[PDB]
Amino acid sequence: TALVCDNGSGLVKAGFAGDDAPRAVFPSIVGRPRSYVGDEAQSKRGILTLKYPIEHGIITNWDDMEKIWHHTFYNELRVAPEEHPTLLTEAPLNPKANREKMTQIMFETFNVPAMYVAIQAVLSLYASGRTTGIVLDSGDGVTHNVPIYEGYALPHAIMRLDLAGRDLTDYLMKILTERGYSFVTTAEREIVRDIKEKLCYVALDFENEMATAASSSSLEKSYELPDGQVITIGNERFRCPETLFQPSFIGMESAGIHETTYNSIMKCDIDIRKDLYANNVMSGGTTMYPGIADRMQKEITALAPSTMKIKIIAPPERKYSVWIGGSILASLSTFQQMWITKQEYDEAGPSIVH
Ligand SMILES: CN(C)C1=CCC2=C(c3ccc(N4C(=O)C=CC4=O)cc3C(=O)O)c3ccc(N(C)C)cc3OC2=C1
Ligand SMILES: Nc1ncnc2c1ncn2[C@@H]1O[C@H](COP(=O)(O)OP(=O)(O)NP(=O)(O)O)[C@@H](O)[C@H]1O
Ligand SMILES: [Ca+2]
Ligand SMILES: [Ca+2]
Ligand SMILES: [Ca+2]
Ligand SMILES: [Ca+2]
Numbered sequence: 001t002a003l004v005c006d007n008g009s010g011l012v013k014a015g016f017a018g019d020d021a022p023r024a025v026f027p028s029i030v031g032r033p034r035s036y037v038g039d040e041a042q043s044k045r046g047i048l049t050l051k052y053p054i055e056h057g058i059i060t061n062w063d064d065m066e067k068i069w070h071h072t073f074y075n076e077l078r079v080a081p082e083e084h085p086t087l088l089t090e091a092p093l094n095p096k097a098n099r100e101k102m103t104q105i106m107f108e109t110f111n112v113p114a115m116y117v118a119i120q121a122v123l124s125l126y127a128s129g130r131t132t133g134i135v136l137d138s139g140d141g142v143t144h145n146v147p148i149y150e151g152y153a154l155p156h157a158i159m160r161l162d163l164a165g166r167d168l169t170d171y172l173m174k175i176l177t178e179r180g181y182s183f184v185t186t187a188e189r190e191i192v193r194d195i196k197e198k199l200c201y202v203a204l205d206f207e208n209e210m211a212t213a214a215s216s217s218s219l220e221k222s223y224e225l226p227d228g229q230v231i232t233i234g235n236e237r238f239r240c241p242e243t244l245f246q247p248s249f250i251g252m253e254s255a256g257i258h259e260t261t262y263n264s265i266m267k268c269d270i271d272i273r274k275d276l277y278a279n280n281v282m283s284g285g286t287t288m289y290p291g292i293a294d295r296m297q298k299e300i301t302a303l304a305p306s307t308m309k310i311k312i313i314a315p316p317e318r319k320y321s322v323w324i325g326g327s328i329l330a331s332l333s334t335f336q337q338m339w340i341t342k343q344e345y346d347e348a349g350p351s352i353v354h
Pocket of ligand 5: 269270271
């Protein structure tokens with residue numbers, strides 16, 4: 001049985017090809033004395049320096065990444081890597097040298113029998129059942145617009161916004177102080193992330209939503225805290241994710257996700273634009289907000305030609321679309337020759353991965 005490992009800036013998603021969802025999901029964090037991995041590392045902040053080996057989707061520290069992979073195989077999945085072909089995912093615009101190092105580590109450190117590396121955005125597109133379209137992938141640390149034509153991600157048109165879930169959680173923590181609530185500790189941040197994932201949503205029209213929240217309490221929702229106290233949240237529910245469309249909310253000069261989507265499409269050949277407009281696919285935990293698809297549909301329509309057919313696809317399981325795409329691909333045993341085997345690695349070296 002093949003294994004699928006999707007390493008993100010904030011979370012590692014791992015499992016067996018064929019499963020409908022990852023069996024293991026843990027924080028992409030490594031702790032080193034002043035080593036531990038995941039929840040275990042976070043728990044020991046202070047006595048351990050924390051390291052996030054994956055920044056903006058790109059691996060930046062190989063020794064820490066090695067620890068993460070070891071943890072995935074031996075502690076989380078509890079499998080013998082030498083017995084399973086392994087599919088790994090990589091961020092858009094990942095340097096070739098990185099792909100080579102990843103391959104060298106899998107064969108020489110973990111001794112896998114075979115492996116394959118796929119681009120995350122492409123896997124998310126496959127998860128929606130298509131090979132052409134533009135993916136909006138927003139996770140914990142980075143957001144990308146990735147146009148894909150017949151399985152090929154067009155590098156020159158990929159857009160990147162260094163704003164994601166982590167920043168949204170921090171922002172919600174900040175604005176919740178306005179109502180007098182104070183969330184500051186690590187434990188408190190965990191509560192805020194839960195509030196964000198349960199009560200936040202994207203307004204179809206921000207200004208009108210603010211007006212509705214100010215003229216009524218129809219948008220207010222209550223939330224019980226660990227101590228038994230109950231708080232009320234109003235416009236904070238939609239102000240938090242609005243940051244995706246208005247990065248200036250958290251002090252970023254970058255254009256919003258709707259604008260980057262449009263700019264991405266305009267960087268592509270005019271003859272395939274129609275296909276991208278009709279196939280806008282959302283992927284990643286930060287695209288889970290109710291209302292985001294309707295908002296993107298409205299914003300893109302405003303930017304696109306009047307006779308352009310616009311369609312946004314937001315799969316219910318998009319929180320794990322990347323992993324799911326990998327599960328699908330890795331489970332196609334008929335194409336087993338696509339796997340890069342150890343033997344092929346011996347004769348051709350790391351460069352065979354490209
Ligand atoms: C199991 N495993 C590991 C695997 C890998 C891969 C694959 C692929 C392919 C094939 C080819 C290519 N390519 C490109 O792209 C370039 C060159 C080549 O070859 C790509 C691809 C993906 O990824 O999808 C594919 C395609 C198509 C299909 N169909 C059914 C129709 C399937 C598959 O499967 C697979 C599997
Ligand atoms: N229902 C939800 N509503 C809002 N945010 C959510 C929800 N579920 C998960 N998230 C956020 O999504 C992020 C996790 O998404 P994920 O796609 O796994 O990112 P990643 O792969 O770790 N990192 P990245 O490198 O940025 O793609 C966290 O910031 C979560 O809080
Ligand atoms: Ca990701
Ligand atoms: Ca600034
Ligand atoms: Ca042309
Ligand atoms: Ca092969």
